[PDB]
Design a binder for this molecule. Structure first.
Ligand SMILES: [Mg+2]
Ligand SMILES: [Mg+2]
Ligand SMILES: [Zn+2]
Ligand SMILES: [Zn+2]
Lengths: 325, 324
C-alpha cells in the first residue's frame, strides 16, 4: 500500500563516523551506510558531506524524493530546537553556532529536524528498544563520554539552554576527579571508558593482593570497561572492587534521577552496556539503596536493546512530526 | 452564559483554612474567598463544606455549571490523581480513602482534578510568580518538610508512580542522617526547619569558639531554624558554619537538578526561604560550584514570589486540562 512507500532518514553524526539509515515510518531499518567525519577546517565540511552523502544515495539507487517524509539528525553539542541550531560541539571544531537545519533543509528540499545525539538515542530506545514507548524514560549512554536523554510526560526534555539530559555531568563526588566540563566529581569521570580505568588506577593502591586486572592497570593499559567487568564476572577480586565503586556512583546518580523524575525505566546503553546483566545488576543494587520506597518499587533499571542503531532510529523518529495528518 | 468566557476554580486545602479562587483561563484573579477547615469526625465534613461554599458562590454570582471549565484542588496527603482520591492527610484526620473527585463531580457536575500541595504551588509560581511562565521551572519548598514540583517542556511531571518532583528525598550525603523514608542523607534531613536544627546540634559539639548559637544549644534552649538563620545574619561565626553546610547540600541538590533538567529557574519557597537573599545567595554560590558552565550561566536561582497565593492559582490551572 502507498503508506508503505513512505520513508524517513535518520542521521547519527559522531566525532569519528556519520551513520545514516532509511527506515519505514514504523521505524524498521531498510538501508544503512556511513562516512568518516571530516573535522578539518573548523568542521565546515561536515554538513556538506552529509548533504552529498544523501544526494548520492538517492541518485545511486534512483530513489523517489517524495517518498521521504523527512530527515532527523542527532549531533554532538546542544541544540536549539526552534532555531535548528547547534552550539557546543567543540569535538567537531564548531566553535561558532551552526545553522545546520537551515543548510540541510535548504540543500535537500525535504523537511529536517535535529536534536542532541544522546537525546535522539533516547528516543530510539523508547520507540523500538527497552523504553517500551513509556511516557517517562531516562536514557544514559556510557562510552567515550557519558550522555543521556530524558523523556518525561511524553516529551523529550531540553531545558532553557538545551542541556537537559546531561547526566554525565551530575556531581557524584563533590571532592572527585577533575572533569573537562570544568568542575570535579562528574559521573563521567568515573563511568566513561576512561573513567573506569581512572577509578581502577586509583583503587589499585587499596588492593594489596594481585590479579590479572591490577597488573594490566598498573602497567598503563587502557583496558576496556567490558574487560574490567569480564574480570569481575570471572571472579577477579580487584575487578570486583572497581565495578563496585563504579556502580555505586551510577547507582547514586540514577537513583537521584529516579527520586526526582520517577521514570518507568532508566535505560543503560553505550559500549560499556555490552557487559550485560552483571553491570545492570550492580547498578540496580545501588539504585535500590539510594531511592525512596515509592521509587524503588516502580522505576526499573534496564539495558539498552538496540545497540548502536538507537541513534539512527531515534533520529529518524524526529522526522515523524512532518507526516501528512 | 458566555461560552467565550468560562472561568476556572482553584481550591487550596490547608489544615486550618480552605482557600478558593475564580480566575479567567488566562489566570487573572476574578474572586477569592476562604472558609475554615473543619477536621472533626475523621475529616468527613471537609468536602461537603467545599461543595456548599462553591454551590453558594455560584448562586450569589448568578453563575451556572456551564460557565466553568473545571475545578482544581491542591491537597495534603497521598494522592491518586487518576481516581481523584486522597489518603494519609493526617492533619485533616483523613485516615481512610477520600473519594474527593466523585464527591465534587457528583454534587456540582463540573469536572475536577486534584494534585499534591507542592505540585500545585509549583504550577502557581511557574505560571504567575518567579517562573514567569517559562516552560521549564522547578519549585522547591522548604519548611516543616522539603517538597517540590517540576514543570518541564510546559507540563507538570508525575513519573510512572506519581513521585516525580520529590526533591526532599534526593540523597545529598550517602553517609548522613537517617531519613523518615528509610534511607540516609536525604536533603529533607538537612534543609527542612527540623533539618537545619539537626545540622546545628551535630556540629556544635566540635566547635569551640564563641557563638551565641552554640551557648544556647548548650544552655538547653529549644533552638529553631529562623534562630540559626538569625544568628548567622548577625555574624555569629558558628551559625554561618551551619548555614554554609545547609547551603552546600541545597547547592548540590539544586545544582544536579540544573545539570539534568536545565530549567530557566529553580524557585525556592516555603518557610525557611524567609531569610530571603541571605539564603538565596549562599544557595546560588554552591549551585555554581556544582553545575557545568552552560547550565551555571543559564539556569537561575530565584525566590518564590507568590507566597501563600501560589497554591490556589496553581490549583486553578489544573482545571485547564478540561478546556474545549
Ligand atoms: Mg542529551
Ligand atoms: Mg510534588
Ligand atoms: Zn563534568
Ligand atoms: Zn528521605
Amino acid at each position: 500500500s502507498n503508506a508503505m512507500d513512505k520513508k524517513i532518514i535518520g542521521i547519527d553524526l559522531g566525532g569519528t563516523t556519520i551513520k545514516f539509515a532509511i527506515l519505514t515510518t514504523d521505524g524498521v531499518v531498510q538501508q544503512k551506510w556511513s562516512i568518516e567525519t571530516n573535522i578539518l577546517e573548523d568542521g565546515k565540511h561536515i554538513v556538506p558531506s552529509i548533504i552529498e552523502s544523501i544526494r548520492h544515495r538517492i541518485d545511486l539507487y534512483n530513489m523517489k524524493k517524495e517518498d521521504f517524509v523527512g530527515i532527523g539528525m542527532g549531533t554532538p553539542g546542544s541544540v536549539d530546537i526552534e532555531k535548528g541550531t547547534v552550539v557546543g560541539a567543540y569535538n567537531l571544531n564548531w566553535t561558532t553556532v551552526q545553522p545546520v537545519k537551515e543548510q540541510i533543509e535548504s540543500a535537500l528540499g525535504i523537511p529536517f529536524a535535529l536534536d542532541n545525539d544522546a537525546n535522539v538515542a533516547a528516543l530510539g530506545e523508547r520507540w523500538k528498544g527497552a523504553g517500551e514507548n513509556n511516557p517517562d524514560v531516562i536514557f544514559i549512554t556510557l562510552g567515550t563520554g557519558v550522555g543521556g536523554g530524558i523523556v518525561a510526560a511524553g516529551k523529550l526534555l531540553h531545558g532553557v539552554a538545551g542541556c537537559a539530559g546531561e547526566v554525565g555531568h551530575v556531581t557524584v563526588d563533590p571532592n572527585g576527579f577533575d572533569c573537562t566540563c570544568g568542575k570535579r566529581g562528574c559521573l563521567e569521570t568515573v563511568s566513561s571508558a576512561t573513567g573506569v580505568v581512572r577509578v581502577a588506577r586509583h583503587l589499585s593502591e587499596e588492593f594489596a593482593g594481585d590479579s590479572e586486572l591490577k597488573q594490566a592497570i598498573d602497567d598503563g593499559q587502557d583496558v576496556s570497561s567490558k574487560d574490567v567487568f569480564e574480570f569481575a564476572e570471572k571472579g577477579d577480586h580487584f575487578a570486583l572492587m572497581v565495578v563496585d565503586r563504579v556502580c555505586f556512583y551510577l547507582g547514586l546518580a540514577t537513583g537521584n534521577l529516579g527520586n526526582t523524575l520517577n521514570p518507568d525505566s532508566v535505560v543503560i546503553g553505550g559500549g560499556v552496556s555490552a557487559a550485560g546483566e552483571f553491570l545492570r545488576s550492580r547498578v540496580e543494587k545501588y539504585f535500590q539503596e539510594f531511592t525512596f520506597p515509592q521509587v524503588r518499587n516502580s522505576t526499573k533499571i534496564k539495558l539498552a536493546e538496540l545497540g548502536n542503531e538507537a541513534g539512527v532510529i531515534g533520529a529518524a523518529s524526529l522526522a515523524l512530526q512532518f507526516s501528512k495528518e
